[PDB]
Amino acid sequence: QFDFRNSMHMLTSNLTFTVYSDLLAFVSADTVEPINAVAFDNMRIMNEL
């Protein structure tokens, strides 16, 4: 039988927001000049010049 006092219910949710999935458009990474690149030991990547 259809009962109204128990079928009624209240929902809970957030007001509003936006969905973000990319998570990479918010970061910028500009490389250093290719000549002056160093390694773990703080020595330049190519030490011949």
Add this chain to the structure above:
Amino acid sequence: KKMKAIVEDFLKRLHIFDVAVAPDDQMYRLRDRLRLLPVEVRRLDIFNL
């Protein structure tokens, strides 16, 4: 400073080679060999001044 240019100038000024043949690797090895020799007195004092 890419130091192969100086070695190329030296080899060309010797006036017997063509820099179109000898590659860069031998130029760099020659540079490393050449660094050891102490320089002439006049040029050393010119650089010091």
